[PDB]
Amino acid sequence: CEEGLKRLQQMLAEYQAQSDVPQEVCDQILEAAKESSVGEDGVRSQVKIRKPNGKNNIRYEYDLITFYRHINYSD
Amino acid sequence: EKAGDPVSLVTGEEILTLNDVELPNGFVWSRTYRSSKASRNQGLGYGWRHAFQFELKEVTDEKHNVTSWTSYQVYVGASCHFLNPNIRIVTLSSGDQYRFELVEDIWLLKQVRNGIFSTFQLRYSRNHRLIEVAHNKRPVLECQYDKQGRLVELLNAKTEQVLTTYIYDEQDDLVGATNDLGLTERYEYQDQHLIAKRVRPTGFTHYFEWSGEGSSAKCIRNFGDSGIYDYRFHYEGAKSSYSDSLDNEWTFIHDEQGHLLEKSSPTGRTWQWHYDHLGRKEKAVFPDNSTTQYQYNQQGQLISKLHSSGAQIQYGYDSLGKLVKTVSPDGDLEKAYYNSLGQRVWDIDALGCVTEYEYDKHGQVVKRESEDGKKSRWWWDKQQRLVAHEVDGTLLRYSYGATDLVNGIAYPDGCVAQISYDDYGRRTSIRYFNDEDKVGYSEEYAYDEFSRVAQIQTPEGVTSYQWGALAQQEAVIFPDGSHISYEYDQQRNLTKLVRSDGLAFEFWYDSEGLLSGTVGFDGLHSQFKYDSMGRIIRKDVADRTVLYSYDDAGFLQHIKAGNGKNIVENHFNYTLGGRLTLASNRHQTLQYQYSSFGHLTKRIQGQFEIGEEFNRVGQRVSQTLPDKTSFNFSYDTNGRLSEIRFSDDSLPKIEFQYDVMGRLSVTETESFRESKLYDGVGRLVEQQWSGREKKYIYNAQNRISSILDNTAGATHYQYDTLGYVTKVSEAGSTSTFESDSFGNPALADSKVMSDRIEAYAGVRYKYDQQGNQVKREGDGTVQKRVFDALSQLVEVHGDSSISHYEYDALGRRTKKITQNGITEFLWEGERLLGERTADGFRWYLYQPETYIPLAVLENGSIYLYECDQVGKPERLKDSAGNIVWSASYDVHGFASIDVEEVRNPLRFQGQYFDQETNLHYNLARYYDPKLGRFIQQDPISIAGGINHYQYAVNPIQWIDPTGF
Amino acid sequence: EKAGDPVSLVTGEEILTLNDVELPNGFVWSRTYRSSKASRNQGLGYGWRHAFQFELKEVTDEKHNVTSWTSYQVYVGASCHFLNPNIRIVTLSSGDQYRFELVEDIWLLKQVRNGIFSTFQLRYSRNHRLIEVAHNKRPVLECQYDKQGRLVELLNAKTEQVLTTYIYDEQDDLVGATNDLGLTERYEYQDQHLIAKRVRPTGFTHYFEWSGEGSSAKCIRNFGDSGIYDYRFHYEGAKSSYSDSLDNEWTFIHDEQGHLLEKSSPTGRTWQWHYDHLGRKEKAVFPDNSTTQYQYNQQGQLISKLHSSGAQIQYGYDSLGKLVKTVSPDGDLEKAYYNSLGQRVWDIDALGCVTEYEYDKHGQVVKRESEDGKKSRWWWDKQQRLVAHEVDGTLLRYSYGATDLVNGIAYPDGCVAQISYDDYGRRTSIRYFNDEDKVGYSEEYAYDEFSRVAQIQTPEGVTSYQWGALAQQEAVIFPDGSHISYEYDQQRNLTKLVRSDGLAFEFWYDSEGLLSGTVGFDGLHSQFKYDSMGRIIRKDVADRTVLYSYDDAGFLQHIKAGNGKNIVENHFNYTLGGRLTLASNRHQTLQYQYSSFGHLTKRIQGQFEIGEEFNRVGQRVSQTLPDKTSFNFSYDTNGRLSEIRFSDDSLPKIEFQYDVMGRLSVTETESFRESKLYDGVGRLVEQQWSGREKKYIYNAQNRISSILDNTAGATHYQYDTLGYVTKVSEAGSTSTFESDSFGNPALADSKVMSDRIEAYAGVRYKYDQQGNQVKREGDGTVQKRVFDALSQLVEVHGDSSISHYEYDALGRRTKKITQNGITEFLWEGERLLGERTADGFRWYLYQPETYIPLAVLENGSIYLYECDQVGKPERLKDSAGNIVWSASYDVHGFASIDVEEVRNPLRFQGQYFDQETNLHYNLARYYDPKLGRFIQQDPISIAGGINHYQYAVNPIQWIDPTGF
């Protein structure tokens, strides 16, 4: 379900976006789009911009489980 | 379990957990219902706890309590060992890193450790009633009673204020909560002490019903207020079934122990779990023809998780600790080490990186060093509050206003922040400052009578939100004046997207709750048929299909798209865990060869070969390009690119420097020095080229208002309330534009049918049923373009010319058969590495992290660019100092070259100007420079933007790389 | 294949290869025969080659004749391609990491890359004859013909000397070699250009007979001079059979291509090989139930090598280079990293270590660094010769004499080494100088008319050898005067070991060439049975039997050592890669628990635990002990132990200090100071204990002549010509001895039957049939011992004392049951770590990597030892600085303790002093200090010495720990 309170942190992330679509719906349109989103896997790019990315501003922002490093596989 | 309500599906017991105080420190006070065996009274009512009750009936005979109620166990993993017969120390030490210390003859609960940094301390009275609840060492909660054994007041033990008000009545039951946020909810119980109606603070009401008698009934018919969640439950002993308000009947099959053995979906999906009568899974069957086999060892620990037709993970523990080894299916090892008091120690990363941690006398992290920089240091005061934090040398300082909330952040450059809270949390305002007396980028938030936001006051405008008493984002009002509503059907699913212009977007969901079918604004339609696992296999567009096909491993390996003709015939060779290393097509075949660690040292594209070498820490150095060319990279502290040297003796090395904030400031190789100056907010305002100057003056709406170029240039721009271009004057040529606040021209020269223009300044376009234009009649000129099934142009003719564009299996442009000659391109994953125009291999070098071009190497010579704050090359000079190439752009970007000595096809951001078509190609689309918008719709229907043809709001401070 | 030496088993082809000159740089000049197709002539006679001609036909068609006799061919793996059309560059690039760069218009080849640091440069004349050969950059070989097309002389282009002078005649065939050493071998051919008799330079001729006709003739009856190497060959269709002069016929069955399929033995062993119709093995069937299955991938590469009832290796190849990944059968994984041109880079080891390599501009290894020490460095000159080499800090200096031989070595201590040679190689003399005018330890060599060492000179004596023109060493003359002869039977196998006394040692061999039964000096017998696989399954001694067993893995599983009674009942259980950790028997059990990273963490010896931890680099630190005691180790540069701390706060840390040559020099913790100094040769001459002084004066024969101890001690020693102790001069207690120069006393009161004494100092000994003494009759004290089936003491009595010694699976003593009480031992590998005598645990700390005792912890206190150069303790002091324990060993180790507060059972080297029997025990045997030799024989029959009871030549400069 989605009957949960939406704090300011959950709204500031969707307000600064251009999709204007909730997450549970946005995660389905981008899922059924692998005809062009497929790229070179196994290597990390140096452009800090992925294929499902797009319009982005030029103003730099530096706004501020958390101390250790996440292992690849964890149950 | 957890279908619409936290009520369990194995039995009829009603379970629900509600939070009371959510402090930023990490203190959680949750209360559960536990309808079963709720005849007991623990001080809050019939069946009401606070997750702080952990009593023991005897001394140490497997007895413990909780809101969700040696001698090592095998089923639960608990091991409570005795320490002292005088004073009992049980030390439960549950399997999920829990800890509880019960005290005998006093009945106290000490040392509630839920991890490494999470502790809990209690303080009772002469009776069996606790009054103080501290987190680590500070009193954060103090409870009071009403001379009857019931908690009625709970403060923070720091300042006198009411936080939780438990209101009771004459039936020994609580009816009010009154949490810190101020949301009070009512309740209603039956004669048998069972809830039957729950009123939400917003106004929603959940009506509960029961089928059996006593304290072992079956909670069925749990419907909402306006028939929202019409849940229906049906039990048949060990089996259960639940149906939603949209006829979605799931069936679970349990056993005499209470495990999961079968879960049948209404569509037909089935799951099968197998055990070994030991309390651990052994076999996990999937709806498709695949099965996972687990393999345990002594004390379980799940030593193997082997998947069919694949590999294993091969977990590992030393004797009792946590994950210290993980053998990924690729074949890379990543070890770890832990001591006897937590405090994680050195751990090796995938390729070669190691991370060393260092703590103080307390249990807080102090230093975290990595290979070649990447060192973070924390500073803690006498309390448990963070003072300073350094990630790459910034040393951001924090400030507290004598409370547990942050009241300011100090930056090394001089920028000072200031937060403004209220009596509650939910920070209200945030403002930025600087060393000088000024202000910039001041935000403002506002809340309604509930705990939700109502309006956001941005320097751009003021956005408003309107909810429907359910927190579902019913309506959103833009600062201009338009509004967008949201319609939701049963189960709270978005259906309509009515805008303020008449058009509307529609969505359709199947029995599994997946989006299958979208109605566009112009009248398009889709199907989105999924398989029995959850992946799309047939897109079924109005005029084209894709026909996806996997390889029973979750990876795509074939894309046979076609609309009757022009078959694509794509193919992939994805291995177990990615690393396809093969992409074959009818035009170009790409191959890759990885190392033993996972380094990419081969980028063979067709007949050409590219290579790169790696260091011991994963850094890439000495990139060898084809045609006997090799570079050299040299890094510095904190892991950044510092020096780029070449192999030829007649090529000087390029050097860069960074500022304190961690951004490129100055760069020079032998005689060309570029310098950038920032104000503090993160925007370029001044740029020097050691001979040229550029300055930018912003307006009051955080937008570029005036640009001053020292080469006799002072251009001005004035936008509208939404930021669209309205007036622009380079020197004295004032232009006028107007839009309909949605990315469509509103002048008296165009005619938009539904969402696309049909004429612009005499030129008339013609769109097809797909959505892309194929004919464009200007001034006696006709251009007919034909497209494939992947929405890509292959041949544009009409102007006495024939061109053939041959792409690859990914979607990038590879071959251009034109009338002039043959041009070949070689990419670098996303960027354009080099090109060949049957005259010489000319390579390009961009910035280390962005798409802004820096230099071009050709004919054994280097030519350096002069890019503005946007990133578009406008000037190109040589090593001597004389200007070689120059151009200009007025409002959108047009070829205005005044001196042409070398072919310069570079454009705004990764684009390529066409000479026979006069369009731009960023990564996969075609943009019109003299129109402002594109010529086709992006693959993302609505999750990419509000308009399918709009490039950006204003082509001044907005970029759009990678095509879409 | 290749049963006989000049015989091929694929067909009747006669292949004979010979190396004429072997340069020390790596140059080799080989020549083959290739009797098949011997109707051609390449200038070196009919059917001969110089391994330096590789002609080719056309651009790249056929030919490419090798020394023996794209364009990618899989069956062989060749990449012969075309690089440029101007000059032909074929670049064969064969599969055996070879490469041959042929050139057109000159008819020659160069760039013969056989490895990484191996090349060959050719220079031909105007005709089809080569004149100069250079190794890397400088010429090394020069040809000289007789103006007729035949190689007559080969010079080194440096000094005018003859190296290989061929001799021809009127039949166009060489009749001589005249190699560098100076040996001449004759050759004779028949009328069809086929060799019929090969004459060796010693005189042993090999006759050859041919039974075929034409060019495909066969070769049978290839016998020797006096019927020593007779070989009968038979070819029936595709089957071949070969028999030696001992009735041992082996059979081979091949296919039509030439690959091996079936190989049988005349005893029952038979192997099987299967292919895949492409020249690659798929299944290998052994003479047992174990089979190996190979699994290839694209381009072969031999990915998997799965063995039956076991694990696989899983070889991983990234490109056409060498191996870059190895997976151990136990689970250990390791990787590598290669560049695009070789020059391997950092690679991780099995467990946790890395090795970083670094090369110079020429491509030679200049640095090889390991983690935390172990770094080797090389320093070369302008040429390709080594100048400096460092391993741990030695930094040796090599000196040359403008030749390819080193004639000087400089050490960082003062002493230098000087080598002396002659016209040829075979170094003549080696001398060791020093900083002062002296000469010590000078060796001299001498050779006979042939290239064999005739005598070896030593400051102790000269040892002569006699040869029988076959290089067999059938007579060895000792410096004393005795001689040992050898008797070689057919096929040159040693049979008898008769010495100059009369007692011999006979050997026996079965029909497979394995040793089966060795007759001892006294007349013992054995069988040495083997199975069909090759391992030993039954010892079959004349009295006892072991009957080893396996578990289908190649490791020992169960032992049945017992002569009918007293079953030992040993049993082990190995894993797929060793690590048994189950050393269990009927008396004791030992198990080892490892970590997750392949590191030992716990050693449970029946009921005790020790525990040990490791670091990230791999060193052992923080070794815990039972009874609440823990040690802490701390290393320094170059990976050496330098600090030892104790858990108790009242115990000071022990510190060590090494010298430049990496030897323990200074040892001190708080007030004790052991100081040792060397003279440069590697022998102790002086020792200080911060209050004491010991000096040793050697003689001219490199033996300890006089010993001066400052505590009123002055002793002298005089030995015989061999080294046996003859006279010991004390302050007036002078003793004299005498031996027969073989290890047995030869006094007037001794009696030896074959090799065991029967009377000494009025004591009689009575031995059993095995060989160890069982009865001892002294001066009124009769003693009787009992031995087990493994030649180990189990109980001794007769002197009114009965005790029991309990052993373990390895063979170490751990439990002593005597009249005093119960004594328990705790070992660490093969060294005694702790003892328990029911009055407190006593632990012993030795030197870092030797057996010399240093300290003892007991009764919560520490006591230090004072050991001499031998390693025997003589003084034990406390922390206060007073004399606590003192002793004195006169000639053999008999204690004369006059003051003893704490019992010190330590002895020469890892021996325990028994209070009941007065015998020492190192690890397996029992040494008698009153006699001077052991009381039983060692398991090694003849590979450990001539005398089975001798301990050492003289117990002043010789040690023998761990028993045998």
Side-chain angles (χ1 to χ4, degrees), chain B residues 359-507:
Chain B
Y359 315 86
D360 51 353
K361 48 185 171 62
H362 289 271
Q364 282 84 40
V365 194
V366 172
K367 200 175 68 60
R368 180 184 65 177
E369 189 247 335
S370 198
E371 284 287 339
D372 203 288
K374 266 68 184 299
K375 178 178 60 180
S376 315
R377 301 198 306 267
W378 294 266
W379 275 266
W380 309 93
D381 56 339
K382 294 321 280 213
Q383 282 80 3
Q384 305 298 92
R385 304 176 299 182
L386 181 57
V387 176
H389 184 199
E390 169 180 348
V391 282
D392 261 357
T394 78
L395 199 61
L396 308 184
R397 293 172 292 272
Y398 297 91
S399 300
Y400 294 87
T403 329
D404 303 358
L405 318 178
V406 184
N407 224 327
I409 295 99
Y411 291 82
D413 69 344
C415 202
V416 180
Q418 179 186 190
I419 326 180
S420 165
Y421 288 84
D422 54 352
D423 305 68
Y424 313 102
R426 50 179 179 177
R427 50 180 63 178
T428 301
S429 195
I430 171 154
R431 200 174 304 178
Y432 291 87
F433 277 140
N434 206 21
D435 57 345
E436 59 206 50
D437 303 88
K438 68 174 183 180
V439 74
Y441 199 75
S442 45
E443 298 181 353
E444 171 87 50
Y445 306 103
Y447 306 90
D448 55 355
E449 71 282 359
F450 289 99
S451 87
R452 299 168 294 184
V453 297
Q455 71 168 7
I456 298 181
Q457 180 174 351
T458 303
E460 270 69 26
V462 174
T463 315
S464 177
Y465 310 103
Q466 294 181 359
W467 319 86
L470 212 43
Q472 287 286 346
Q473 193 86 334
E474 262 201 353
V476 52
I477 288 94
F478 295 93
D480 188 1
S482 44
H483 63 275
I484 292 184
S485 315
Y486 291 81
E487 294 184 354
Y488 296 89
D489 63 344
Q490 315 302 315
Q491 300 293 327
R492 304 310 300 181
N493 296 120
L494 181 60
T495 42
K496 216 166 186 179
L497 203 56
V498 280
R499 64 207 292 183
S500 159
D501 288 346
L503 302 179
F505 209 94
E506 298 186 12
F507 302 93

Side-chain angles (χ1 to χ4, degrees), chain B residues 10 142 200 208-209 220 351 489 509 518 536 552 571 675 779 835 862 955:
Chain B
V10 46
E142 203 143 30
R200 283 180 169 265
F208 296 90
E209 294 198 328
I220 62 174
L351 315 175
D489 63 344
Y509 302 92
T518 42
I536 168 179
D552 71 36
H571 189 264
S675 171
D779 186 315
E835 47 181 7
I862 55 177

Side-chain angles (χ1 to χ4, degrees), chain C residues 365-370 373-380 386-398 410-412 637-638 640 660:
Chain C
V365 186
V366 60
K367 180 181 293 296
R368 183 176 62 94
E369 174 145 30
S370 198
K374 266 68 183 298
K375 175 182 63 180
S376 315
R377 298 200 64 177
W378 288 272
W379 281 279
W380 319 78
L386 183 60
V387 175
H389 179 204
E390 176 179 345
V391 45
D392 271 346
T394 73
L395 196 60
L396 313 183
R397 288 185 294 270
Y398 296 92
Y411 297 90
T637 325
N638 305 330
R640 291 172 179 172
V660 54

Side-chain angles (χ1 to χ4, degrees), chain A residues 1-3 5-8 11-12 15 18-21 25-26 28-32 34-36 38-43 46-47 49 51 53-60 62-64 67-69 71-73 75, chain B residues 3-4 229 302 315 329 334 344 347 349 357 359 365 368 441 445 451 458 463 465 472 486 492 509 514-515 534 539 544 546 548 550 574 579 592 594 663 681-682 831 851 941-945 950-951 957 959-960 964:
Chain A
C1 310
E2 69 206 50
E3 273 69 27
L5 182 58
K6 295 184 178 181
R7 305 301 300 271
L8 188 61
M11 296 294 300
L12 287 182
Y15 169 73
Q18 77 286 344
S19 87
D20 208 319
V21 177
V25 178
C26 187
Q28 303 194 43
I29 304 179
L30 298 180
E31 170 206 330
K34 52 182 60 180
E35 71 196 30
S36 54
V38 49
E40 300 181 356
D41 291 287
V43 65
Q46 59 273 346
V47 291
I49 289 180
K51 192 61 174 297
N53 260 18
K55 323 184 182 305
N56 189 316
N57 207 330
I58 65 177
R59 172 172 169 266
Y60 285 91
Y62 295 92
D63 314 328
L64 78 153
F67 295 148
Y68 297 155
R69 203 187 83 259
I71 303 304
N72 283 167
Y73 294 92
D75 298 330
Chain B
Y229 291 99
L302 192 58
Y315 307 93
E334 32 184 28
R344 172 180 285 196
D347 53 329
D349 197 358
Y357 307 93
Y359 315 86
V365 194
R368 180 184 65 177
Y441 199 75
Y445 306 103
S451 87
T458 303
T463 315
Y465 310 103
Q472 287 286 346
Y486 291 81
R492 304 310 300 181
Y509 302 92
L514 299 179
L515 176 58
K539 191 172 187 177
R544 55 190 182 92
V546 192
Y548 300 96
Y550 300 93
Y574 274 87
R579 310 180 188 273
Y592 310 99
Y594 285 89
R663 295 168 296 182
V681 204
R831 298 174 174 176
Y851 286 84
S941 45
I942 203 61
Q950 181 181 178
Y951 173 83
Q957 52 190 14
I959 60 180
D960 198 319
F964 61 95

Side-chain angles (χ1 to χ4, degrees), chain C residues 819-862:
Chain C
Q819 262 73 70
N820 284 47
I822 299 284
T823 299
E824 295 272 13
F825 300 96
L826 299 178
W827 302 71
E828 183 199 31
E830 296 176 345
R831 192 166 55 184
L832 176 62
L833 181 62
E835 191 191 0
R836 191 253 285 270
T837 168
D839 299 69
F841 286 86
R842 314 173 65 253
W843 284 287
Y844 304 96
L845 293 180
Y846 306 87
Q847 303 279 62
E849 276 187 349
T850 90
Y851 280 82
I852 302 179
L854 176 63
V856 46
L857 281 167
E858 96 276 2
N859 202 296
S861 311
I862 177 68

Side-chain angles (χ1 to χ4, degrees), chain C residues 598-647:
Chain C
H599 269 160
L600 177 56
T601 40
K602 188 173 299 300
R603 306 180 65 176
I604 318 164
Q605 299 184 180
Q607 52 181 347
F608 301 94
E609 284 174 67
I610 299 180
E612 51 206 279
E613 281 286 320
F614 282 91
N615 209 19
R616 181 181 122 267
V617 187
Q619 300 163 154
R620 187 190 69 175
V621 292
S622 159
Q623 179 202 12
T624 304
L625 285 185
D627 196 38
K628 314 302 161 33
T629 307
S630 48
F631 297 156
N632 299 90
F633 300 101
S634 303
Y635 300 86
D636 58 357
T637 325
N638 305 330
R640 291 172 179 172
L641 181 59
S642 159
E643 183 176 350
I644 299 180
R645 303 179 303 273
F646 308 98
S647 159

Side-chain angles (χ1 to χ4, degrees), chain B residues 52-68:
Chain B
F52 274 83
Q53 315 170 6
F54 324 98
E55 299 71 19
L56 216 157
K57 170 60 184 302
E58 62 290 336
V59 279
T60 42
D61 299 349
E62 320 306 335
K63 171 58 175 51
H64 189 84
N65 296 345
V66 70
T67 193
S68 304

Side-chain angles (χ1 to χ4, degrees), chain C residues 701-715:
Chain C
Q701 298 180 355
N702 196 20
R703 294 171 184 174
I704 296 185
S705 159
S706 192
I707 299 181
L708 299 156
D709 186 359
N710 222 22
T711 303
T715 171

